[PDB]
Amino acid sequence: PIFLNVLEAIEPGVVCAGHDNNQPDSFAALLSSLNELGERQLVHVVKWAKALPGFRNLHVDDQMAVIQYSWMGLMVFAMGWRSFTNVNSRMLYFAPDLVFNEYRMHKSRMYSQCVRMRHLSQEFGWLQITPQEFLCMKALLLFSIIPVDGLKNQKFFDELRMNYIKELDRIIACKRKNPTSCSRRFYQLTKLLDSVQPIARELHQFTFDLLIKSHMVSVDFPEMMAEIISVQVPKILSGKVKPIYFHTQ
Ligand SMILES: Cc1c(N2CC[C@H](O)[C@@H]2C)ccc(C#N)c1Cl
């Protein structure tokens, strides 16, 4: 079980936000803490990505790009898992010290986005996603969004993507002696992965708008954070960079 060995070995651990839970909730405090958390999550995703099997076959610039474009979706995906495993998807488990009840969902002004994120979280339970299915799915999320004009070396990317699809296909939980079982299972997981992208887009839009008006609402954006949001995210929001869907929408 070599592939799965790697994924579990490299799976990040706990990442705290730094948030002061003894102060009364407020938009600026909430979003500042999420942004700091995004910065911290980003560092970890970078190290995780680079330790992935076959990832360094990618050209150097494609590596950072692929990381930057997928960063939100990957965060959202793993955050839903934490929420699923730690609170049965009742609240959003961004970090041990940053857990969103309904009131923070409202005070963050992200209620519509949070609702979608919680739905994804509930899907892990509804589908009974195994932890092994989660790891391969998350690995695959990293290779699910590219420039329409293509990467610097697309061949190596397509090869990686193909192989991560195959690894996901090997490990799906199904009665192998029944073809219909595994077909259905695969369909569902492909559908679930597809459902991360619209959510990532809504978040992309929110953070982008938030960044533009940050100097009025008093929200802090960390350095790597703001680089990504001002340079990479608009390529997504403008159609230059699109998600690879399994199923046509
Ligand atoms: C959506 C999101 C984060 N967003 C929410 C909006 C904010 O601009 C920030 C980038 C931050 C951290 C995690 C985690 N973990 C997640 Cl899932």
Swiss-Prot record:
Steroid hormone receptors are ligand-activated transcription factors that regulate eukaryotic gene expression and affect cellular proliferation and differentiation in target tissues. Transcription factor activity is modulated by bound coactivator and corepressor proteins like ZBTB7A that recruits NCOR1 and NCOR2 to the androgen response elements/ARE on target genes, negatively regulating androgen receptor signaling and androgen-induced cell proliferation. Transcription activation is also down-regulated by NR0B2. Activated, but not phosphorylated, by HIPK3 and ZIPK/DAPK3. Changing residue 112 to N: In prostate cancer; somatic mutation. Residues 1-248 are annotated as: Interaction with CCAR1. Belongs to the nuclear hormone receptor family. NR3 subfamily. Ubiquitinated. Deubiquitinated by USP26. 'Lys-6' and 'Lys-27'-linked polyubiquitination by RNF6 modulates AR transcriptional activity and specificity. Changing residue 207 to A: Found in prostate cancer; found in bone metastases; alters receptor specificity so that transcription is activated by antiandrogens such as cyproterone acetate. There is a cross-link at residues 175, 177 (Glycyl lysine isopeptide (Lys-Gly) (interchain with G-Cter in ubiquitin)). It is found in: Nucleus; Cytoplasm. It comes from Homo sapiens. Changing residue 80 to D: In AIS; loss of androgen binding. Changing residue 92 to F: In AIS; loss of androgen binding. This is Androgen receptor. The record marks 50 as: Interaction with coactivator LXXL and FXXFY motifs. Changing residue 245 to F: Decrease in CSK-induced phosphorylation. The modification Phosphotyrosine is found at residue 245. The lineage of its organism: Eukaryota, Metazoa, Chordata, Craniata, Vertebrata. Changing residue 2 to T: In prostate cancer. The chain holds residues 672 to 920 of 920 of the full protein. Changing residue 232 to R: In prostate cancer. Binds DNA as a homodimer. Part of a ternary complex containing AR, EFCAB6/DJBP and PARK7. Interacts with HIPK3 and NR0B2 in the presence of androgen. The ligand binding domain interacts with KAT7/HBO1 in the presence of dihydrotestosterone. Interacts with EFCAB6/DJBP, PQBP1, RANBP9, RBAK, SPDEF, SRA1, TGFB1I1 and RREB1. Interacts with ZMIZ1/ZIMP10 and ZMIZ2/ZMIP7 which both enhance its transactivation activity. Interacts with SLC30A9 and RAD54L2/ARIP4. Interacts with MACROD1 (via macro domain). Changing residue 50 to E: In prostate cancer; found in bone metastases. Changing residue 210 to Q: In prostate cancer. 17beta-hydroxy-5alpha-androstan-3-one binds at residues 35, 82, 207. Changing residue 227 to A/Q: Reduced transcription activation in the presence of androgen. The record marks 227 as: Interaction with coactivator FXXLF and FXXFY motifs. The gene is AR.
